[PDB]
Amino acid sequence: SRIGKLLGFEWTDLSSWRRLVTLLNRPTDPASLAVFRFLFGFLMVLDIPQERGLSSLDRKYLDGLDVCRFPLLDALRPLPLDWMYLVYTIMFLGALGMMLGLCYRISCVLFLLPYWYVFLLDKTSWNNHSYLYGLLAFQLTFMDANHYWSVDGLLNAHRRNAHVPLWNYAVLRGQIFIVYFIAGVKKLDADWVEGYSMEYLSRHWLFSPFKLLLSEELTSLLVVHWGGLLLDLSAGFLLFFDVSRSIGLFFVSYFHCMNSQLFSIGMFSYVMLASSPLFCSPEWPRKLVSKPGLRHQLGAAFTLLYLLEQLFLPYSHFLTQGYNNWTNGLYGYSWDMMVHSRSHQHVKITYRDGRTGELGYLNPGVFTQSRRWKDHADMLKQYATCLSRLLPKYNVTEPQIYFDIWVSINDRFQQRIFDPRVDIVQAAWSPFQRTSWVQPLLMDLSPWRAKLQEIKSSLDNHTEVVFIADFPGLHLENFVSEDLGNTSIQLLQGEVTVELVAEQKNQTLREGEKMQLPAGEYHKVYTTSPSPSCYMYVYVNTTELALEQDLAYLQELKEKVENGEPTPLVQTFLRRQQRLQEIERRRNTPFHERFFRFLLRKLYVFRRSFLMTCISLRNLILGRPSLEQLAQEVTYANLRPF
Numbered sequence: 356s357r358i359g360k361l362l363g364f365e366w367t368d369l370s371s372w373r374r375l376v377t378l379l380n381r382p383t384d385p386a387s388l389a390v391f392r393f394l395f396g397f398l399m400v401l402d403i404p405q406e407r408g409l410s411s412l413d414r415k416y417l418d419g420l421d422v423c424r425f426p427l428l429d430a431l432r433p434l435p436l437d438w439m440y441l442v443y444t445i446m447f448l449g450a451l452g453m454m455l456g457l458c459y460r461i462s463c464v465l466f467l468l469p470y471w472y473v474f475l476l477d478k479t480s481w482n483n484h485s486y487l488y489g490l491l492a493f494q495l496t497f498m499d500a501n502h503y504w505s506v507d508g509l510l511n512a513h514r515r516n517a518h519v520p521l522w523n524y525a526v527l528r529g530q531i532f533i534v535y536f537i538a539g540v541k542k543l544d545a546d547w548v549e550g551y552s553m554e555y556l557s558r559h560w561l562f563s564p565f566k567l568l569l570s571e572e573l574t575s576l577l578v579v580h581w582g583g584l585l586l587d588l589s590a591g592f593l594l595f596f597d598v599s600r601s602i603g604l605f606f607v608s609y610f611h612c613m614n615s616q617l618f619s620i621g622m623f624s625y626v627m628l629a630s631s632p633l634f635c636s637p638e639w640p641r642k643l644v645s646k647p648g649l650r651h652q653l654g655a656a657f658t659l660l661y662l663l664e665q666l667f668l669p670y671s672h673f674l675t676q677g678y679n680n681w682t683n684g685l686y687g688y689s690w691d692m693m694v695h696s697r698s699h700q701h702v703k704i705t706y707r708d709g710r711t712g713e714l715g716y717l718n719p720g721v722f723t724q725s726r727r728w729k730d731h732a733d734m735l736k737q738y739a740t741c742l743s744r745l746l747p748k749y750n751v752t753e754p755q756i757y758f759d760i761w762v763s764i765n766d767r768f769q770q771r772i773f774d775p776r777v778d779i780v781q782a783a784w785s786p787f788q789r790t791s792w793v794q795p796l797l798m799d800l801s802p803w804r805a806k807l808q809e810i811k812s813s814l815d816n817h818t819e820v821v822f823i824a825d826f827p828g829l830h831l832e833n834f835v836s837e838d839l840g841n842t843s844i845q846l847l848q849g850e851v852t853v854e855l856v857a858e859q860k861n862q863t864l865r866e867g868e869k870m871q872l873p874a875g876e877y878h879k880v881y882t883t884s885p886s887p888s889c890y891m892y893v894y895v896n897t898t899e900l901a902l903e904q905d906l907a908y909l910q911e912l913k914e915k916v917e918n919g920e921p922t923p924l925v926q927t928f929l930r931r932q933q934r935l936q937e938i939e940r941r942r943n944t945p946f947h948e949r950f951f952r953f954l955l956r957k958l959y960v961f962r963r964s965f966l967m968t969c970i971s972l973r974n975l976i977l978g979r980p981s982l983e984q985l986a987q988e989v990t991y992a993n994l995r996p997f
């Protein structure tokens with residue numbers, strides 16, 4: 356029958372529970388599962404000492420210097436350095452055991468435990484590939500892949516050349532299809548259909564022949580955005596059918612190779628390439644060489660429940676209102692890669708003393724190791740709690756901490772994200788309720804960006820225009836510098852007051868009015884309307900302005916008569932010229948020198964990781980020697996091999 360030829364199954368097995376159970380447990384050849392197991396083990400062995408932090412473990416959890424952690428659960432506290440090195444050693448031993456296929460269950464447990472522990476230990480390092488690695492580890496733990504091409508066959512003849520059930524293939528195929536389909540359906544965004552996101556990626560040299568047949572706007576619009584969506588849909592769909600197998604495999608391989616070359620994601624693309632050929636016939640590596648029980652019901656119930664859970668999970672942001680933010684939820688467990696970009700401008704942290712009442716300012720990125728806390732509420736709350744418990748170390752009383760964070764998403768209006776008058780230390784945050792101290796985004800200016808495009812077709816190219824939207828009640832204080840000549844402010848919408856404190860003069864502005872700000876003084880803008888206000892700064896100050904004035908003077912002198920202690924400006928210009936010549940030389944440099952330097956750096960990373968692991972194991976087993984020998988070993992370990 357054509358139905359069973361194409362779909363691989365019949366309808367009459369779906370009529371009964373027992374018929375479905377008997378259908379889902381047909382035996383098959385284990386060769387491709389063993390090939391995928393070997394490839395996944397080798398890729399994880401190569402991937403552990405590079406991205407997970409085995410080399411950089413000594414400066415992430417160094418003793419003495421306290422860093423505000425960001426765990427999912429507040430009870431989690433990391434172990435000291437020797438125990439963390441022991442945990443990474445146990446994880447590497449489990450990865451080696453999964454790679455060689457000996458003692459498969461214990462190896463899968465010893466790989467599944469510390470990877471999930473490290474993934475739950477840190478929220479700032481969440482990504483798509485770590486979550487995919489955790490899901491693939493949890494999937495491959497339960498399956499049996501030790502029946503072909505393994506040391507377990509040599510150590511035991513009972514587990515060599517044996518059959519495997521169908522659901523071990525079905526779960527992995529469903530997982531890959533779920534990842535592809537969820538990425539494709541999450542790429543249907545309002546900012547992605549207009550091509551604003553990742554619009555600067557078309558300037559890369561790997562798109563060099565694509566500019567030969569298409570214009571730059573056409574290459575940036577049709578190929579990057581729509582072509583990626585079509586490639587995701589085709590990678591989801593074409594691998595199921597036997598007619599579209601080879602062309603779909605070629606497209607998947609080309610897409611994964613291009614994404615591996617274009618970005619710095621790591622070894623995610625190689626793992627996707629290793630999981631790509633699983634959709635073929637289950638005897639494809641073999642040609643290269645030459646009443647049901649209760650567990651049958653368990654292997655189907657687990658498959659159905661896991662598929663339902665993984666289908667429901669990426670659209671489960673409607674229950675996580677506590678972690679909800681401007682866009683949606685947390686990041687990483689939604690498969691929406693490369694959709695949004697950030698450009699942070701300024702962060703100001705103020706503190707008021709609880710006893711003296713004095714006001715002071717803190718450093719922007721003090722006591723923190725990451726830059727991902729400026730977009731999420733829970734990380735801000737944990738940072739406030741950490742600063743509240745840390746600030747008495749510097750002769751400070753019980754503090755009041757006020758934040759002021761400005762951010763822009765996908766080149767929009769720079770507006771505040773939180774209210775700067777709410778103390779976060781005494782504030783309330785719950786995972787099951789909507790937060791009350793998050794400013795909503797102003798999407799009403801979205802067509803007026805095109806009007807801003809008209810402003811982008813306005814005046815000199817060297818001029819600068821900044822779009823600022825302000826909430827009612829707040830005030831923006833700025834210091835226009837002395838060099839900022841010809842600085843003007845134009846009001847677009849609302850009612851604002853501009854105040855100069857040097858002469859104590861405040862004026863009200865109307866729509867369309869223009870004002871000239873003083874240079875070298877502090878100024879403030881207040882919103883004095885019930886509605887939020889939108890306005891624009893038009894100014895040009897910089898070395899571009901100075902060089903344009905000097906270029907006009909030199910051009911006038913040239914057309915009149917002529918041709919066209921150290922010197923820091925001349926040396927800076929020569930350094931920029933030498934930077935351009937070094938870029939041109941790197942383009943002209945053959946690949947072998949860069950490859951040798953890359954291999955030397957990777958060998959240094961691997962050697963430093965192995966030496967630090969050996970030093971930590973010697974300190975754990977044989978105790979801690981005197982500090983002179985330890986300092987000598989630290990100096991010897993950090994030395995480049997050469």
Ligand SMILES: *[C@@H]1O[C@H](CO)[C@@H](O[C@@H]2O[C@H](CO)[C@@H](O)[C@H](O)[C@H]2NC(C)=O)[C@H](O)[C@H]1NC(C)=O
Nearest residue numbers: 813814840841842843844845869871893894895
């Ligand atoms: C300083 O203010 C702004 C730049 O900050 C400029 O003002 C423009 O004035 C010129 C004519 O002088 C007009 O063509 C432009 O349309 C004005 N800018 C607007 C309305 O966007 C100019 O560089 C300086 N102002 C003056 C009066 O010279």
Ligand SMILES: *[C@@H]1O[C@H](CO)[C@@H](O[C@@H]2O[C@H](CO)[C@@H](O)[C@H](O)[C@H]2NC(C)=O)[C@H](O)[C@H]1NC(C)=O
Nearest residue numbers: 828830852854855856858859860861862881883
């Ligand atoms: C110009 O008018 C504004 C508008 O009232 C004044 O701004 C206020 O400043 C005072 C203290 O300077 C505060 O007590 C008020 O709460 C502010 N108003 C708002 C709505 O926040 C500004 O001080 C005036 N400047 C001069 C020089 O008179």
Ligand SMILES: *[C@@H]1O[C@H](CO)[C@@H](O[C@@H]2O[C@H](CO)[C@@H](O)[C@H](O)[C@H]2NC(C)=O)[C@H](O)[C@H]1NC(C)=O
Nearest residue numbers: 836838839840895896897898899900901923927
């Ligand atoms: C405003 O104009 C000044 C012109 O001096 C710009 O500054 C120079 O700034 C760069 C850093 O961006 C320094 O490396 C140079 O040494 C400065 N030149 C000097 C001091 O002669 C400045 O970037 C412009 N923009 C702002 C926001 O101030």
Ligand SMILES: *[C@@H]1O[C@H](CO)[C@@H](O)[C@H](O)[C@H]1NC(C)=O
Nearest residue numbers: 745746747748749750751752
């Ligand atoms: C005041 O602060 C300094 C540095 O923070 C330190 O000596 C100590 O915490 C305080 N000293 C006294 C005498 O209270």
